[PDB]
Design a protein around this ligand. Structure first.
Ligand code: HEM
Ligand code: NA
Length: 248
């Protein structure tokens, strides 16, 4: 359902160069998971009914960073500012989504297609739209389905983004990595979810909700058994998430 806008050759050249610089920077700084959180969590404010929120660079705004759910994302925004300044032609909206795509690539994940042209929007969406880690499957469908317009398959695949990174007690309050290899993008998130509660690893109530839902569970099983199938579905879901409200 997407009709991507035309951008100039100079814009495209900046995208290509920024992608390379983001690879080096994100790998060096060890911040891929934080960048993926920035891209993905920020895209998740989209409401399809009203066509408000979404991946339009408003997460840069102090007012949106101040939302308690976004604790720590100010670090991500600050880390990217020097690099962003080398590419003044790019929108912040595109830059942040490109950083998320690169985060997945540099950690060994699939190549998520990227299309430029998002325009930086003036108004942050209201607080309260983000997925709540303490809630369950009904809630996930409310946020990803009813608001964002994504599928049940997308919900499970995207939950797999937690295959990289960790929670922090000073940010959300939850603490620790979901996987034993939190800088490696693989299907371990699902393997760990299936194996039970291993000491030292994190499972949010929202992760656990996937195991007991009739639709989500077969997907967890599929991804734990078949990393290729996970990578395919993940790349599709991440692209859709990164493009909510954009190009239709
Ligand atoms: C499914 C609903 C989701 C919930 C309930 C959720 C919740 C959370 C929470 C509570 C944290 C910990 C923040 C902290 O304390 O530092 C977190 C981190 C993270 N999230 Fe999500 N999230 C969701 C969806 C996503 C999606 C769709 C992606 C990307 C595809 C994603 C990527 C990440 C990553 C990579 C981190 C680690 C950040 C770091 O290492 O600093 N999350 N998420
Ligand atoms: Na991992």
């Amino acid at each position: 359902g997407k009709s991507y806008p035309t951008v100039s050759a100079d814009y495209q050249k900046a995208v290509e160069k920024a992608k390379k610089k983001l690879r080096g920077f994100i790998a060096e700084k060890r911040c891929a998971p934080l960048m993926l959180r920035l891209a993905a969590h920020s895209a998740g404010t989209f409401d399809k009914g009203t066509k408000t929120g979404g991946p339009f660079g408003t997460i840069k705004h102090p007012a949106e960073l101040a939302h308690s759910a976004n604790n720590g994302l100010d670090i991500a925004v600050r880390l990217l500012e020097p690099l962003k300044a080398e590419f003044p032609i790019l929108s912040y909206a595109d830059f942040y989504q490109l950083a998320g795509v690169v985060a997945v690539e540099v950690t060994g994940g699939p190549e998520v297609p990227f299309h430029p042209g998002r325009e930086d929007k003036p108004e942050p969406p209201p607080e309260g739209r983000l997925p709540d880690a303490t809630k369950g499957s009904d809630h996930l469908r409310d946020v990803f389905g009813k608001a964002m317009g994504l599928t049940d398959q997308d919900i499970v695949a995207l939950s797999g983004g937690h295959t990289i990174g960790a929670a922090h007690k000073e940010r959300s309050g939850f603490e620790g990595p979901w996987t034993s290899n939190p800088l490696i993008f693989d299907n371990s998130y699902f393997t760990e979810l299936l194996s039970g509660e291993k000491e030292g690893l994190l499972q949010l109530p929202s992760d656990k909700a996937l195991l007991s839902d009739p639709v989500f569970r077969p997907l967890v099983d599929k991804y734990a058994a078949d990393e290729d199938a996970f990578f395919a579905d993940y790349a599709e879901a991440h692209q859709k998430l990164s493009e909510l409200g954009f190009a239709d």
